[PDB]
Design a protein around this ligand. Structure first.
Ligand SMILES: N[C@@H](Cc1c[nH]c[nH+]1)C(=O)O
Ligand SMILES: N[C@@H](Cc1c[nH]c[nH+]1)C(=O)O
Ligand SMILES: Nc1cnc2ccccc2c1
Ligand SMILES: Nc1cnc2ccccc2c1
Lengths: 406, 406
């Protein structure tokens, strides 16, 4: 007996499970098309240098890396964004901007699950908060398409620029800002104070606990960069009709080094699950990768696990049975040639159809039709075939001419 | 500057290239649904033991394998069939048969390209040639859906049972049959005679060169296992309406150890390309993996490269431009809130729509609309907004009430 279980921390998707995944992905695709994003993809295997950021990020700590026989340092991607940037930087001046790109890559880690699929959506070449508005709306749109409401979930929103100001105004060099976000992201675990030592810590704490935009306007003015952007953001989301889905939370920073402005997280309103999705603006990434001109970017990742737990809890993942329009049933083996001709007509006309492949009695064929979720069974029998007909029976036995089956 | 090229032997899919891939995959999916197959998937990372067959197969020679930090021998799958069998064997008695499963996995090698996507289609629990008929028809159906005809391509068909008889009748132990197929598959390169030594070689040669089923009927009878099956196969394909797509070729064995019966290959009728797809029956695989009951199986793999070359040569891959139904254009920033409300209505009604995200003049917005392949541009201007209207202009400027846009 061979080992039937999959490799450690990896999922099998037999047809039952695959229908569930495909239900989720159909939404990701449909939302992307509704929002005018273009699909792209890149190798799951990337060069390890792509992810060496040196900021203590959990995503790079837990990187599934290995050495080829030719001695190259490579890894199964922990995230997609660096791949996106490589492609963008590769295209250079030939890329029309603004660009809106999406994908649903499988991403990896070594530490629990070692893989997940992650919908990625990114807008490139847009400086204004209109990008983040669109992105946050897309995420809400996908969750609403899955049957969730603003009673079920929300998106917490913030700007890193606020904290940046404090880091700056507290005489704390620009260089160290990314380390601080990464540490402060760990707040939800108790001894984050210890990491920041390795005062300006206090001002960070107070600013995370500020419960409103007015309170941040009071801390650094109604026309700070962050205040105007957040107001603009909330206004646009309100106008698009998703006001009840979004809110301000000063504690949201995200764990990734490269976020420079607005950042956001989806969450369940019952407090039962980790972040449903996550993202932000990252206007400097392409500059760090060597771009001669700064390229504004923003985007998000939306995993395939947390969302499924949430949907299961809310009872929004009813089992989806397989279906097929027709099952064609030879009365016996001598009718197979004729049954095949009929299968051809049905498929020719855009229908999904099986033919009983094995030899079996009609009643067993009918049972089989019902097991595979057939809408209709088409019996091809000698006496009917002479009249130019088949027998049709709906499952969700009148005789029918061949021309009228479609 | 970061390395913009992808890892060795791996392809990037920016949006242009992705539309081409998606055009191909839409066919693979659509054909699978037309033929009633159910989608499945499994980890690209499998345990290396899955592929140790010890028959000199090129697919296992060139296996992209490596050792985890925990010391496990794993590999990026060179093919899908073993993964399929693992899943099937895992399900055991709970799996309803017959089962028809498909997927489009990315598969790997280390040696040229190191990755490709491969449509897999497999029928499980069907002893009769009706399985192989369906499979071969599915492959033809996909190629016809891509615009090819029986003048462009065909499927060569054969049974390994013929050669098995010769191997047996030539006092050559059953054990060594798989090695022989793998060697004889190399015939198309000159010194295959040398490998078979490492006589019965002559009888193998003659039987590969037999140009018809009657000639094989003359060599071992009109009621050999292989003769009846091949006749049944050609009859069923004829009846389904794909007679001009298929033909007999005694030289076709395929390179994989596990094929036991009918085997087949798609090919271009100009002799310019390698095999388009390939498959056969493999009734013993699950028995070798430890199944207590023999499970008949048959299937095929259909790669994503050769087919694309062929389609390019035949001029059947016209560039596919991106499209989107509407682009919404704020007359200026003060109209953004109103433009957003309109974007909402359009998307609500099932349309794909952008809104100009950046700040720009109307003429530039219109140009942008044309670049991204918009069918329609929707200008939201102050004077029209007061009349409850927008300006609409078709690209493939009459005023319109909001209700009538959808
Ligand atoms: N790469 C981020 C998500 C993201 C996409 N684009 C920008 N951010 C993550 O893995 O959490
Ligand atoms: N695994 C085979 C194709 C196949 C699928 N099912 C049976 N055979 C190949 O890679 O060539
Ligand atoms: N880079 C990451 C992040 N989160 C994950 C969650 C589950 C499985 C794999 C993952 C890989
Ligand atoms: N196992 C295989 C077989 N053929 C391939 C062709 C191209 C790239 C990768 C491949 C992997």
């Amino acid at each position: 007996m061979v080992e039937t279980e999959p490799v450690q921390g990896c999922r099998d998707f037999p047809p039952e499970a695959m229908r569930c995944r495909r239900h989720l992905f159909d939404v990701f695709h449909a939302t992307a098309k509704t929002f005018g994003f273009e699909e792209y993809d890149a190798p799951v295997l990337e060069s390890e240098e792509l992810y060496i950021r040196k900021a203590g990020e959990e995503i790079t700590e837990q990187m599934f890396n290995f050495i080829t026989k030719g001695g190259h340092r490579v890894a199964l991607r922990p995230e997609m964004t660096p791949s996106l940037a490589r492609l963008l930087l590769g295209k250079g001046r030939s890329l029309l901007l603004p660009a809106k790109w999406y994908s649903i890559p499988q991403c990896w880690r070594y530490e629990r699950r070692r893989e997940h699929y992650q919908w990625n959506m990114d807008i490139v070449g847009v400086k204004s908060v209109s990008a983040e508005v669109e992105l946050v709306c897309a995420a809400c749109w996908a969750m609403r398409s899955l049957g969730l409401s603003s009673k079920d979930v929300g998106i917490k929103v913030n700007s890193r620029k606020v904290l940046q100001t404090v880091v700056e105004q507290a005489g704390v060099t620009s260089d160290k800002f990314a380390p601080v976000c990464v540490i402060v992201d760990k707040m939800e675990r108790e001894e984050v104070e210890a990491q920041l030592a390795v005062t300006v810590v206090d001002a960070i704490t107070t600013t995370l606990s500020l419960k409103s935009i007015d309170e941040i306007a009071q801390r650094v003015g109604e026309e700070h960069e962050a205040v105007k952007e957040l107001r603009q953001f909330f206004e646009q989301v309100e106008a698009y009709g998703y006001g009840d889905w979004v809110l301000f939370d000063a504690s949201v920073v995200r764990g990734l080094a490269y976020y420079t402005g607005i950042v956001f997280e989806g969450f369940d309103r019952e407090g039962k699950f980790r972040a449903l999705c996550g993202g932000g603006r990252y206007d400097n990434l392409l500059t760090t990768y060597g771009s001669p001109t700064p390229i504004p970017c923003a985007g998000f990742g939306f995993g395939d696990c947390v969302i499924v737990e949430l949907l299961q809890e809310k009872r929004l993942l009813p089992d989806i049975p397989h279906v097929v329009d027709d099952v064609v049933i030879p009365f016996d083996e001598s009718m197979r040639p004729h049954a095949l001709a009929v299968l051809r007509r049905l498929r020719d006309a855009g229908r999904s159809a099986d033919i009983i492949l094995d030899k079996k009695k009609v009643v067993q064929a009918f049972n089989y039709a019902d097991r595979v979720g057939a809408v209709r069974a088409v019996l091809v029998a000698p006496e009917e075939w002479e009249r130019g007909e088949v027998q049709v029976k709906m499952l969700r036995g009148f005789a029918v001419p061949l021309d009228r089956l479609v």
